[PDB]
């Protein structure tokens, strides 16, 4: 049984000079050079011991500098010897054949026309499928060279060709950096990037399928000095779907050496070379850090990335991290992660990152800092699985095994110390003693140590009184809980200014979602409104503020355009997790009586179960009908999260809260509608957004909303 083995290689010739005419295959000079090179390669192959198995040789391309011929050859050999004809063996045989004839007085027929350098011969394995892929792409083809410090712009592809290949060659000592930018909104082309001269599957750097909205820029590095780019399946005919730039980049060492200071703050970052570009296939990073004392351990906070264990033989695709001889492999997930490394004997810590296989993922950035070994989270609870400080005893389970909400004294309730009796938080520091001998209203004015439901003023100080924000009286020394309290004041069918923060998000003249104004230029909403196909484009949408009647215009309303649109990075469509989105307005809102922002709750804001809140959303009054012509308010009662966790069984996360409607009927709630709740000071606080629910018509099911206090950090980061 004869088997065909494919070897693709490059051979350098010093007696020939590259010319521009060789770049075009249709040129007569290129054809003559290809014929001569094929004849020389066939003679060289037949001269060696492999000539008995030689099948067919063909020169594929020519390169810059010394005349570099990239060709492919086939050997029909017995199967039993297939393991013996490794590419290294073939390369060694070719080198020996080239070297033997140099000293000999006899002149080879091919040596009379071409002088080949033995050191320049490179051979790699290939497959019949690789041969077919190369042999169908013999149409659209260009060759180019990239000089130092010069950025090259592509030459436009031909729409007639169904598969185009760019062959990129640069300096030997420089790496090639390739930039992809997405011009069209969405498109259906396929692209592949390979580290070698041809489309060899084993050498694939990265393959881009699809054409996405989330990220417009794709930056790819190549370990070598050569690169191949293959574009295929332009299905719906248009032009310029994408833009490539390319440039040479210097190689530098990412290994470092530092000593940590005395602090508990994140002191810096560690990143792969050329962040956020795709790391090189052969990268190697070594980081050495010295802690100031044995009492501090090292915390590494990741972003959409995590480490996990592996079985030694298995090579992990994502990457290999070694931490003090412990081996770990990455796993890109849409949740935060923190690796905590204790120190026992040596203050020095060593972190290594290595790429184990050819396939490369996006760059990795990790924030490093110190943490006191004992009680690592001060006033918080450390979830063991993912090493994050989660709130303790606030009624919300924040750890997969739920150890933060277990066997504590007063769950979501204040604890008198005189006789250990739980009393309600609204009774603390209100103005009348409710603990038997006055503990509840002690130390209300001074600074305290932070815990659960303790508002933290701007100078990292704490406040005893629960919900002290925007209540018309200073509560901490800083006075930061009364600044910017201009929101939340109002001016069944709603009236002409009952809910000034309500906004309508419309495209093509119809109302798809509702939203709540949170700043002068930002509107919060739900992410699942942009899930549809054509609706993700920013240009389409239009926002209306200060309107109650959908049918006819009224003096109050104003219309803006959406400038930017940011979804939450960890948003999951299948589980509705992290269902929140932000829209930037064209220009800031003028604070009239018709339009006023809603007050954003703090991270420690307490929303009490059993409290009544209002869902102010347009909705279809009857099943299957149009949206109602009048904005309709309806009240719901908050439910403890244990109850709806038992209702939904592994489907409700710390980022969601639950509300129940009037028993015996309604379900119409809109999408992205607010769930504002009134405070004791007469101000409305936005407590959630309409996310999902089951059962319009089921007897006792609840609606599930995006818990804003669980995503308040990202909101404040984006807005500020």
């Amino acid at each position: 049984v004869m088997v065909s083995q494919v070897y693709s290689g490059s051979l350098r010739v010093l007696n020939r000079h590259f010319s521009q005419d060789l770049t075009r295959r249709e040129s007569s000079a290129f054809r003559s050079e290809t014929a001569k090179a094929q004849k020389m390669l066939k003679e060289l192959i037949t001269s060696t011991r492999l000539g008995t198995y030689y099948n067919s040789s063909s020169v594929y391309s020519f390169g810059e500098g010394p005349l570099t011929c990239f060709f492919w050859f086939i050997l029909q050999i017995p199967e039993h010897r297939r393991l013996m004809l490794s590419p290294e063996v073939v390369q060694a045989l070719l080198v020996e054949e080239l070297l033997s004839t140099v000293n000999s007085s006899a002149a080879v027929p091919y040596r009379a026309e071409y002088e080949v350098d033995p050191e320049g011969l490179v051979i790699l394995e290939a497959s019949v499928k690789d041969i077919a892929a190369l042999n169908s792409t013999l149409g659209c083809y260009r060759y180019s060279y990239v000089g130092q410090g010069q950025v090259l712009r592509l030459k436009g592809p031909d729409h007639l060709a169904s598969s185009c290949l760019w062959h990129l060659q640069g300096p030997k000592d420089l790496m090639l950096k390739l930039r992809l930018e997405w011009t069209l909104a969405e498109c259906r082309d396929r692209l592949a990037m390979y580290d070698v001269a041809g489309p060899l599957e084993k050498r694939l750097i990265t393959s881009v399928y699809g054409c996405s909205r989330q990220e417009p820029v794709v930056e790819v590095l190549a370990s070598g000095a050569i690169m191949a780019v293959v574009w295929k399946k332009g299905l719906h005919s248009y032009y310029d779907p994408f833009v490539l730039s390319v440039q040479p980049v210097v190689f530098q060492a990412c290994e470092v050496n530092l000593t940590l200071d005395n602090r508990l703050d994140s002191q810096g970052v560690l990143s792969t070379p050329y962040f956020p570009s795709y790391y090189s296939p052969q990268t190697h990073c070594s980081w050495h850090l010295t802690v100031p004392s044995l009492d501090y351990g090292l915390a590494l906070w990741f972003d959409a990335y995590a480490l996990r264990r592996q079985k030694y033989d298995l090579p992990c695709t994502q990457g290999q991290w070694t931490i003090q001889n412990r081996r770990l492999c990455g796993l890109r997930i849409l949740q935060p992660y923190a690796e905590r490394i204790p120190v026992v004997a040596t203050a020095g810590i060593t972190i290594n990152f290595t790429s184990q296989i050819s396939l490369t993922g996006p760059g990795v950035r990790v924030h490093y800092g110190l943490y006191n070994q004992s009680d690592p989270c001060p006033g918080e609870f450390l979830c063991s699985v993912n090493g994050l400080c989660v709130p303790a005893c606030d009624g919300v389970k924040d750890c997969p095994n739920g150890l933060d909400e277990r066997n504590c004294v007063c769950r979501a309730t204040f604890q008198c110390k005189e006789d250990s009796t739980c009393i309600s938080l609204p009774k603390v520091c209100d103005g009348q003693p409710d603990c038997l001998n006055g503990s509840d209203e002690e130390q209300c004015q001074e600074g305290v140590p932070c815990g659960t439901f303790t508002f933290q003023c701007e100078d990292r100080s704490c406040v005893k009184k629960p919900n002290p924000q925007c209540d018309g009286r200073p509560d901490c020394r800083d006075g930061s809980d009364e600044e910017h309290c201009d929101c939340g004041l109002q001016g069944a069918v709603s009236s002409e200014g009952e809910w000034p923060w309500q906004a309508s998000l419309q495209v093509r003249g119809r109302h798809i979602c509702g939203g709540a104004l949170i700043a002068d230029r930002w509107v919060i909403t739900a992410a699942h409104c942009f899930q549809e196909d054509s609706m993700a484009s920013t240009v389409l949408w239009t926002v209306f503020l200060g309107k109650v009647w959908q049918n006819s215009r009224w003096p109050g309303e104003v219309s803006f355009k959406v400038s930017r649109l940011l979804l939450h990075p960890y948003h999951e469509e299948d589980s509705h997790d992290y269902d929140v989105a932000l829209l930037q307005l064209d220009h800031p809102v003028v604070r009239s009586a018709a339009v006023r922002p809603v007050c954003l709750p703090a991270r420690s804001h307490f929303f009490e179960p059993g409290l009544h809140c209002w869902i102010t959303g347009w909705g279809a009054l009857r099943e299957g009908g149009p949206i109602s012509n009048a904005l309709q308010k309806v009240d719901v009662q908050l439910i403890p999260q244990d109850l709806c966790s038992e209702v939904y069984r592994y489907q409700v996360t710390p980022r969601m809260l639950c509300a129940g409607y009037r028993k015996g009927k309604a379900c119409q709630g809109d999408a992205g509608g607010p769930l504002v709740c009134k405070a004791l000071s007469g101000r409305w606080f936005l407590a959630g957004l309409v996310s999902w629910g089951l059962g319009c018509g089921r007897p006792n099911y609840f609606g599930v909303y995006t818990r804003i206090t669980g995503v308040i950090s990202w909101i404040q980061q984006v807005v500020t």
Partner: antibody
Amino acid sequence: EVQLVESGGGLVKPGGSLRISCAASGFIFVDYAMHWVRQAPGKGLEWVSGISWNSGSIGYADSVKGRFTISRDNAKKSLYLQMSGLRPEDTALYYCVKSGFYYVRSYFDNWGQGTLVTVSS
Amino acid sequence: DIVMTQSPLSLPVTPGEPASISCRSSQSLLDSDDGNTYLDWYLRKPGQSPQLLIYTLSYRASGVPDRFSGSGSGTDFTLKISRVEADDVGVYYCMQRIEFPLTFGGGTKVEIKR
């Protein structure tokens, strides 16, 4: 202009299953509701199922509730109907109807040529 | 479920005189929230696909001529053909859409006398 092409149909064993599908063009697919309307060979028209602009409010008929399932795919711009538990009554000619608005209870705007589904031993 | 009845079951009309078709429901077709009647009149041609003639009891489609006029109140609805031509041959249906499950009417043939 507006084009709706149905596919599937044919002969089905009385007890098997089938899947039929529309094929819409000439309009922005994700703006309007979609309906299936079957007509018996000698009787009048009869509603089957209807779906809203984004599968938000699926609603079936009474005699086919629990046996049929309507769905859509805004990407391929297509409408699908999973029909199962066929009986000698379900034989008819099916029309793919494009409604006039985004909700199930809007007037029927465009009608397709329809495909015949027959059941026999 | 709103049962719809049509009258008469058949009607022969020569070209020139008006014709009337009556549709009676089991309930009233007024969405209180908007005051819109949810009845539509469709015409099924011989061997063709059904067309849309009247929607919401008053308005006509983009190709329907002026010879068709819809009217009614509450439960009793009337479609009037002012002048009958040789092309208005087929079956006429009245459909309600005020509740789920939507129900097509019964049918009314039209025959042209010559």
